[PDB]
Design an enzyme around this catalytic site. Structure first.
Site, PDB file in Angstrom:
ATOM      1  N   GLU A 121      38.952 -36.635  15.690  1.00  0.00           N
ATOM      2  CA  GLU A 121      38.654 -36.141  14.357  1.00  0.00           C
ATOM      3  C   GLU A 121      39.850 -35.450  13.694  1.00  0.00           C
ATOM      4  O   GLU A 121      40.154 -35.704  12.527  1.00  0.00           O
ATOM      5  CB  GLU A 121      37.458 -35.194  14.419  1.00  0.00           C
ATOM      6  N   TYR A 149      37.618 -33.547   4.467  1.00  0.00           N
ATOM      7  CA  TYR A 149      38.790 -32.838   4.986  1.00  0.00           C
ATOM      8  C   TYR A 149      40.119 -33.592   4.948  1.00  0.00           C
ATOM      9  O   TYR A 149      41.143 -33.024   4.576  1.00  0.00           O
ATOM     10  CB  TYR A 149      38.511 -32.318   6.401  1.00  0.00           C
ATOM     11  N   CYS A 206      32.441 -26.663   5.344  1.00  0.00           N
ATOM     12  CA  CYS A 206      31.987 -25.498   6.098  1.00  0.00           C
ATOM     13  C   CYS A 206      33.218 -24.647   6.404  1.00  0.00           C
ATOM     14  O   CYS A 206      33.180 -23.417   6.340  1.00  0.00           O
ATOM     15  CB  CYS A 206      31.331 -25.933   7.409  1.00  0.00           C
ATOM     16  N   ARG A 226      32.244 -20.596   6.112  1.00  0.00           N
ATOM     17  CA  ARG A 226      31.107 -20.077   5.363  1.00  0.00           C
ATOM     18  C   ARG A 226      29.772 -20.252   6.078  1.00  0.00           C
ATOM     19  O   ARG A 226      28.816 -19.520   5.816  1.00  0.00           O
ATOM     20  CB  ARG A 226      31.036 -20.740   3.993  1.00  0.00           C
ATOM     21  N   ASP A 262      27.045 -23.227  13.145  1.00  0.00           N
ATOM     22  CA  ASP A 262      25.930 -23.563  14.023  1.00  0.00           C
ATOM     23  C   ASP A 262      26.384 -23.166  15.429  1.00  0.00           C
ATOM     24  O   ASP A 262      26.847 -24.007  16.196  1.00  0.00           O
ATOM     25  CB  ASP A 262      25.671 -25.075  13.941  1.00  0.00           C
TER      26      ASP A 262
END
Ligand SMILES: O=C1OC(c2ccc(O)c(Cl)c2)(c2ccc(O)c(Cl)c2)c2cccc3cccc1c23
Ligand SMILES: O=C1OC(c2ccc(O)c(Cl)c2)(c2ccc(O)c(Cl)c2)c2cccc3cccc1c23
Lengths: 316, 316
Positions: free
Chosen positions: B60, B146, B198, B218, B221
């Site tokens: 990623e 992103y 996020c 912000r 999980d």
């Protein structure tokens, strides 16, 4: 006491701070990553160990809420926090005809008489703002500043975004939203801006009826800046709470680079030997609920009985 | 041990977290304002009390560094973290012809057989991405993610900004800059985006040769997301350090709303009764120094001997 987190920060930067020279010739002591928590239910976090002029905080924040970017409003309130930024573009514009004024800020404390010349030149600049409407709109307007970035963000599709306005509606219709964010950072303007936003980004939060706000400050001037900064955002929280009919919760102050300029050491040290008095209280007009239309008189600070102010040279 | 700050967070949300129902039908326990500090010199902060697949983190992050926004790359690495986001726009487009698939995520755990239908439909979607170039560019590309916001921010003046690329040059030519910031938050796109970033904003810092990074998240999980999040940014720091020839310092993880979904209670509790083993180490190819051209093989993780993985239902 309420403000303890601030003093704990000062003591921290003095004890653990690594020496870091910076942009200005005056070096600093800085740290990276710090967070302070203030329970707004215990009182308004305004320093009692030093006399912070609450007036200026009001004058500036209301300026922000009004989506204003013209220094005139501030000068019309005896607030001179942004003057230099506007004045700077005045001495550079091919219309001004007087002394050189190259990076005046520095010479204003190293060479006598020149400082008087500066304050003299500044007087004419400020005067021409309050009276000459055309001059005010040309040099009084900063353009890219908190007022516009908060309430008039510019899109690629030639329009404008009322960030704060929207987020307030959001709190009202979706309080538990983890997206209640407002940003002053714009990648497009940042590469050329004079002073990129220090108060980079902030977020709201609602839980059990109490509103809270977190502020990400990429840079902080512990002695001079932080005392004001805290007040501005503690107030901003109250305002947003007042309108949304919510109770006030906490103010979380997160820092990127928190620093202390070398010539502030003795002052901060002297401040650390001061016992904090009980925190003051804030009174917001119970009748008026639309904060954008708020005015100075609509905000009251009670029981504020601080120590005398501490004079310290501004870092340049 | 290194990862203690994460466990201390879990224990914290369980002890002090206030119940907060959210967007999804599954409620949560959340807090506002938290910061964790990881000393990257003690090892790579990958959880040993649970087996986090480091592979996915690589897959990623490299995707991000390449300014990529097409899911194809990930599928071409067995990474399926973003599939649903692309697939969602496939079932809505007037070209797809099969089951309804309305908010499939929820039905994929309440109704048997339908889940098989879903995984079946997904298989064809994914397959058509890796092979049909035209399909890949149409539905495989996410656009706003992103990869592009980091390295292809769009200006009002119809061009693009390589945020990360620039900031890296900045670190190199002005390390002590308090402006080493990169933002994924864009007020213009945020009102309509499916999942607004996020990992809202991050900042670099250089001191005594050691590089550090702070991340403002912000939303978080705790059980599922945070373990990955930490790894991604701890890695990102190493990469930026590798290129800038700087030593690695700390990773500061700041949270807005950090939460724990109710159906993760027992799992996290079971995780809390696990003693952490010594942290692993990261090996970055000493020859290659331009991280954008980095590839999987250029990153190694040693001494990673974690506990077994902990199965937990994804919140929807
Ligand atoms: O970071 C700064 O600071 C300066 C500054 C600071 C506070 C302030 O209220 C005002 Cl208006 C201006 C500044 C001013 C005087 C100086 O001697 C030096 Cl070196 C730097 C400043 C003056 C002129 C242009 C500037 C451009 C970028 C950053 C600064 C900057
Ligand atoms: O916040 C979300 O979550 C959803 C989600 C979550 C994780 C994930 O990986 C993917 Cl692709 C999608 C979602 C999915 C299934 C659901 O049952 C519900 Cl209620 C919500 C989701 C699905 C569809 C549209 C969405 C729009 C905004 C926010 C979400 C959202």
């Amino acid at each position: 006491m309420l403000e303890q987190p601030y003093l704990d920060l000062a003591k921290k930067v003095l004890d653990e701070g690594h020496f870091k020279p910076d942009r200005t010739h005056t070096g600093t002591y800085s740290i990276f990553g710090h967070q302070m928590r203030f329970d707004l239910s215990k009182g308004f976090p305004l320093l009692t160990t030093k006399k912070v002029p609450f007036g200026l905080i009001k004058s500036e924040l209301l300026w922000f809420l009004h989506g204003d970017t013209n220094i005139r409003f501030l000068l019309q309130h005896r607030n001179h926090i942004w003057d230099e930024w506007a004045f700077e573009k005045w001495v550079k514009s091919d219309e001004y005809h007087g002394p050189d004024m190259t990076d005046f800020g520095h010479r204003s404390q190293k060479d006598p008489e020149f400082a008087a010349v500066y304050h003299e030149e500044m007087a004419k600049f400020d005067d021409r703002v309050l009276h000459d409407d055309a001059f005010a709109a040309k040099y009084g307007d900063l353009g890219l500043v908190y007022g516009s970035q908060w309430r008039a963000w510019h899109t690629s599709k030639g329009d404008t975004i009322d960030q704060l306005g929207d987020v307030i509606e959001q709190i009202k219709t979706h309080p538990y939203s983890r997206r209640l964010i407002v940003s002053a950072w714009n990648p497009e303007d940042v590469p050329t801006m004079a002073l990129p936003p220090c108060h980079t980004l902030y977020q709201f939060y609602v839980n059990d009826g109490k509103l809270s706000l977190q502020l990400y400050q990429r840079s902080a001037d512990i002695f001079l800046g932080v005392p004001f900064n805290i007040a501005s955002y503690a107030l901003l929280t109250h305002l947003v709470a007042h309108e949304c009919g919510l109770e006030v919760g906490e103010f979380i102050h997160t820092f990127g680079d928190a620093h202390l300029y070398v010539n502030h050491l003795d002052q901060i040290k002297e401040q650390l030997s001061r016992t904090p008095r009980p925190a003051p209280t804030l009174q917001l007009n119970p009748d008026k609920h639309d904060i954008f239309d708020f005015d100075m008189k609509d905000i009251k600070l009670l029981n504020y009985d601080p120590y005398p102010a501490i004079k310290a040279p501004v870092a340049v």
